[PDB]
Amino acid sequence: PVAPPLEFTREAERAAWLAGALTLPSSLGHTETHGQERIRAVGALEAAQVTLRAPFTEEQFQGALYAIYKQVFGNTYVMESERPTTAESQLKDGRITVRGFIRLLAKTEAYKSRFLYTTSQNRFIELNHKLLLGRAPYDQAEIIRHLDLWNSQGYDAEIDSYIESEEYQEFFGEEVVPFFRGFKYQVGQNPLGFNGLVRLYDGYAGSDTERNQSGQVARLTDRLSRPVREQSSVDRIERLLRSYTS
């Protein structure tokens, strides 16, 4: 008669005894309870959403501005000789949303100066994705689409393709400051999206700075390039062989 009555003291006792070996410390997890430390994105992920409810008060308007100028421009410093004061004033009463304000900051000459003029179009596309969306581009189709769109319709339309896209509407919307989100698994990505956001985001202290001896070269177009356009390598091989041996 193991335990006829409703009391289970023997079953609970034996469960509590056998649970000792089920909660033994594992091999090691010191560098494993935080894998974000390996991704070096602890600060990016622990940074909460910065919304602006329209009846908001004076304080944290400066907070939202700090978040925006840290996100859109990167950790690059932006001297208040560059802050568009009319745009901030318009955003203050809600004449524009945070989405319209970020549209403006994208279309200012400081953003262009830091990202467009000194870099090729590839690095510009990657930076637009990483700053106004939070994710690395997934495939060369995005790069081709954005490059041709810019070439044919101007920087204005190229940026509007980001700001009024449905991804921006869903993930952030009108009133949420963009944040880096590729560190988590975002629905319908490649494993290259996460790798790309890791590659672009080298550190919390670091930034994507024009004033650098690299010349602000493209970090990722080599990474992003191969997978879509190397299935034809196996044949281009012998085509090159017949070209050489000729």
Partner 1 sequence: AITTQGKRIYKITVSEAGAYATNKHRTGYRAPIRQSNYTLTVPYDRFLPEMIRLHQSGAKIVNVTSVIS
Partner 2 sequence: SRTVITEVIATADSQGRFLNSTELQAAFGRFERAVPAIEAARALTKNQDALVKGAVQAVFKKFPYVTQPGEKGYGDSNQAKCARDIGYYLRFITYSLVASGTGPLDDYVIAGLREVNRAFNLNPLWYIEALNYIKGETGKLLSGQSKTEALLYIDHAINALS
Partner 3 sequence: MNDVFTRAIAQADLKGSFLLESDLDKLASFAKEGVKRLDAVAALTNNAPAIISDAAHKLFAEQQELIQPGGNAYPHRRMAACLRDMEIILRYVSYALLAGDASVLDDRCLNGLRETYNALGTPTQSVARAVQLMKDAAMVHLKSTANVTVGDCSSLYSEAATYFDKAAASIA
- Residue 233: strand, helix, or coil: helix
Per partner kind, with CB cut-offs from 5 to 8 A, the member of partner 2, ligand CYC, partner 3, none near residue 27 is: partner 3
| Phi, psi of 204, rounded to the nearest 5 degrees | -65, -40
Q: At what angle do helices 98-106 and 61-71 cross, to 10 degrees?
A: 40
Q: Where are the alpha helices (DSSP H) in 36-139?
A: 36-39, 42-45, 61-71, 85-92, 98-106, 109-115, 121-132
Which residues inside 60-99 make contact with partner 1, applying CB under 8 A?
95-96
Please name the amino acid found at residue 188.
G
Binder of residue 95, out of ligand CYC, partner 1, partner 2, none (CB less than 5 to 8 A by kind): partner 1
Distance CA 224, CA 126 (A): 10
- In the DSSP assignment, the letter for residue 69 is H
Q: Does 47 bind partner 1 (CB under 8 A)?
A: no
Q: Does the protein bind partner 3 through residue 43 (CB under 8 A)? A: yes
Nearest to 87 by CA among 78, 98, 79, 77: 98
Residues found near partner 1 in the complex (CB under 8 A): 51, 95-96, 156, 160, 164, 166, 169-173, 175-176
Residues found near partner 3 in the complex (CB under 8 A): 10, 13-14, 17-18, 20-33, 35, 37-40, 42-43, 46, 53, 55-57, 77, 79, 185, 190-192, 194-195, 198, 202-207, 209, 211-214, 227-228, 231-232, 235
Residues found near partner 2 in the complex (CB under 8 A): 6-9, 11-19, 22-23, 46-51, 57-60, 62-63, 66-67, 70
